[PDB]
């Protein structure tokens, strides 16, 4: 149930 902003749309930093 995770949000896409934190998982699939997240990137390296």
């Amino acid at each position, epitope marked *: *149930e995770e*949000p*896409g*902003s934190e998982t699939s*749309d997240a*990137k390296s930093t």
Partner: antibody
Amino acid sequence: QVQLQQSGAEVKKPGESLKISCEASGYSFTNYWIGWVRQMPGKGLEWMGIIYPGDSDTRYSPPFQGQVTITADRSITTAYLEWSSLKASDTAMYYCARVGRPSKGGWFDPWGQGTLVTVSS
Amino acid sequence: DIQMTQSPDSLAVSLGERATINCESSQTLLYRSNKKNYLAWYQQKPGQPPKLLISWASTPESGVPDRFSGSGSGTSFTLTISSLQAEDVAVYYCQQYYNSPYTFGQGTRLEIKR
């Protein structure tokens, strides 16, 4: 300070191609998602799509996926929104906006001033 | 995709009185790991771009007046102007940023009631 300077207001005809720009500054261009928002005359905001300039990876909504192409350039820190063939329905205000936090999806902050694209025969 | 539905479409509140702008999402915006509602409110005044008012449902930006406040969790949400002023006349939009596409609501036009 963070600024998102956009191109001037366009007046085109149906069938013509167009490429509106958004010159970003005051932050690391690669590390944030940057996107586009449509607002037609006397209507609400419509989330078109975003792009991550670190690897040119894009996202769209179903109305605008297939209709437009969101690209970017790292050397000049400029995001784009491209039409191959304009229509009369594309007459709208096109706001540019960076996502509010680095390396992740999110709310838009800050926004650009906007580009009045007008399409008519 | 997630559909955002605000209520009402147009709102008329008198100067001094409480303005209540709701926003109902189709599926839940609360994430149980960090306990954060992934919702942002916006203020678009006439002839200007949209300005960020509130992020994370209940965290306003720096410079926003105290009369403005954002409440609710999960599906149901609310923007609350406790005492309306003349400057507050604007179209207000909610937006989820849980899953892409990060869709907006249709918008709530706030006018002065006389």
